[PDB]
Amino acid sequence: PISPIETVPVKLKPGMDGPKVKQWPLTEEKIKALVEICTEMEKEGKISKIGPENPYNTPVFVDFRELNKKTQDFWEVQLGIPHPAGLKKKKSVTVLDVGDAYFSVPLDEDFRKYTAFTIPSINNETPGIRYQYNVLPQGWKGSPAIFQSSMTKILEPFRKQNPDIVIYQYMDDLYVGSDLEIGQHRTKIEELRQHLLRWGLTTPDKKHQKEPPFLWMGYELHPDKWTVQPIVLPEKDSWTVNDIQKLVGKLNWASQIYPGIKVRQLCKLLRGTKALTEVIPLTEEAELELAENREILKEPVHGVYYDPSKDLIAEIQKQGQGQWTYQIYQEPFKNLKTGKYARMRGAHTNDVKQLTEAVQKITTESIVIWGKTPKFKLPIQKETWETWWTEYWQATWVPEWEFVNTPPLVKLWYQLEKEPIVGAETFYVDGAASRETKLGKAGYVTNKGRQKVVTLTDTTNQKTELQAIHLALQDSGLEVNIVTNSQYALGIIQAQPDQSESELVNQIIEQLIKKEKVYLAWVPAHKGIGGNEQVDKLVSAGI
Amino acid sequence: TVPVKLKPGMDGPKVKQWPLTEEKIKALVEICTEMEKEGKISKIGPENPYNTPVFAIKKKDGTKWRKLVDFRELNKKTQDFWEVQLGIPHPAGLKKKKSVTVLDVGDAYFSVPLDEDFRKYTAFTIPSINNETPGIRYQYNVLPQGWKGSPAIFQSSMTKILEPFRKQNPDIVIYQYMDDLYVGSDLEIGQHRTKIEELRQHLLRWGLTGYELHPDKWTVQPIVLPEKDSWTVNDIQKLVGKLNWASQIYPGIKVRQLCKLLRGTKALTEVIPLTEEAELELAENREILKEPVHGVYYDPSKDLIAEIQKQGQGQWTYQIYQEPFKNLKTGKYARMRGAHTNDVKQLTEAVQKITTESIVIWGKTPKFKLPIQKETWETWWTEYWQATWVPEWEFVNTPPLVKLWYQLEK
DNA sequence: ATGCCTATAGTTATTGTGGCC
RNA sequence: GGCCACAAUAACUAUAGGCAU
Ligand SMILES: Cc1ccnc2c1NC(=O)c1cccnc1N2C1CC1
To answer: Motif range for Tryptophan repeat motif (chain B)?
Structure first.
């Protein structure tokens, strides 16, 4: 009888009721100003006077933090933030700011009694005048959910009448963009203003309209291009511990537009856990990539909008160890959006495999923003691509990819032989270590008769088996046959280790490139095989 | 109508929506608009917190885009309604037949309306390009496709219409599962097509509207050991390691005599002749591999587990087991030679092959172990997906020991 | 059997950037 | 302080192998 646009029924959680917190102590200096605000909202039709029938109370700051916990769960307003690179290019863009947004869209009668608040008393603890929200209150969890759903119903017939125009809604602000001329675009907004005025929404006039440069989510928007806001960093001394991580976050936000962003060496300093004020000093390797990052930030660059007619092209580059950077572009030189793949969990991930993992990150991101799979350009050869995945256990598929050579080329180091080498010396690999005091031995027994036994300090069982392979390839010719008993050592040689970990393996990898043919075989441990038992007795002699 | 109640304590499903391609998004709107006008789905506000994942699949017979809704989260909570309250009887003489014909009966569920209180739980959100639209919401007014509670309510009507069909053919055993109909016939292949046509004509009389499988050809193929005239040290070392891993599966195989052949350090090039004890043991091990192992039994209380392994050069093998290292059903699919094959397509067709076999023999969806990433699988599985039933799958490591053992299977 | 190591999958807690109440 | 989107870093569970008791 008073509220338009048909109210949507909202109910509380069956577990607990609304707020029951008492009123805050009096201020007197702030109460007098609040009297004029409550009287103005009462005349318009936002709040109404109620008696002592309402038991619920809300403190005036007005805080709705206690109410939100009692209110039922609502579906999320936005599913992923829109990126300026995936947007369509428009000739004229005009924004509309909604005046009295939550004041127009009302609340259901059943929920109106739960949003009742009490104004602090004047003197002698008086009851005062009670008020309850009839419309959507400021600071409620369900406020942005209902308002967005109501606006969709308003602009439902408007989109069908004009399919050529694209309208977007964001909380209170509405963005209108079209490929039409400046004269025709101005008429469409005037018709859009009259459509919103019917329900009761205030829109600014032609003189109060905002200029083509817009500021949204920290991005500077233009009708033809888009650019990020310039980030200013202090250039004197490296301060505290958390500010080092802040520089990584600034580079993280710069990774979406700047292709040359390195963060690997900066994250190495953040290895120290449990610290309030640590103050990390600068090193040679960490500041080396920090110097080149500042040079790219000096020159201003702009991104390009998405075009449906042209296909998306992506290319993979290598800038460091275990770090990949990619750029998506439709036209040469003009980039749309750049990305990165820098996370390393600890163990080896393989350069060929991590490259495919980087592609999958682009593919999934392209579905959300662009909506279609882009054409990839890999720095790996077609011959190397087919050899790796056929022998590997994990299966992956790339639909469309082209071979394009890049300055930082990635090549395979070594490949294990399938058939045993004839006339070559046979090496048996077996090692054992103790948990107490941390001591282990490594040795190898050959068919000729030569053998070497060494002792190691501060080592695990996984490292002692790894050390025995290194010594077997050290005192050998060109063609080496390696027989190992451990399953752990078998998996490392088959794969290609390239990370911060596996420093001991890097000595073996360098030797494997020098050798022409290397054979590897696996045998069961502790059974009674000739050649394996002889090595086992030597390592477990003192252990 | 019948009221549907959820399991006490557990709340409704809340799963995040997976993004879809631009071609699939516009395809979903076309179906949703047609269903809204007929009276199948209705729009709801933002007050609904429950979300259901939705995907788009292509059809072969109708060559059109079909709407697929995943109810795997809801099925775990609504298991009391479809088993305890209204259970589906499963015959033992369904796995033993000559020819099984698969027919889609999912279109018949759009007639029976859903409960008013349960309508809010079947709400789903449609993904959009760059999140331009907030998201168009729809709730199911009738029985949805892919839900296990739909056949339970329809069971009272399904038994009545199949009553004259069962009376005419007592020897032919019929079974209903989810949205697919499975009919097993013991007649000839020329007479099998006539029997299905008569059953399909009965459906048109009621109101609502070559693919064949061989259940007799699912014989367990024995794993055979490679035959060699001259055995070398390298050949023995690989043979001992593979059979030692299978010692926990098969207790009959012993590697005691094989290890005694090698004495001291020797080169792989050297040829070692087998003794009388070595030849007797190796030949005996082949007999244990051919004969089915004792201790294989089906238990409905325990969940079924399936593991698929990649071999290479267009070769795939799978093992169906309830308990670790205790196989129940073994089989392998090589390559679908004819048009186009890839790493995803060969795996997608493999899962659908096991799922169809699981219904006829047992009647439960197994846990699929896939040698693929979660981000890779959840993007390209919809491209080659045809079946309306979606099984539960997990992603784990594939050992090198299990790969080198099942490659010798004929 | 449990505690202690490595690798393959996944999950969470923490911080940061951009916003909001 | 909580909520939303995206990233970097530390911990915890299934599988496979290993060591110690
Ligand atoms: C903030 C925002 C939100 C949603 N879309 C857009 C934008 N705004 C852009 O500024 C914008 C600028 C130029 C062209 N299209 C744009 N766009 C499709 C309508 C442009």
So the answer is: 377-393
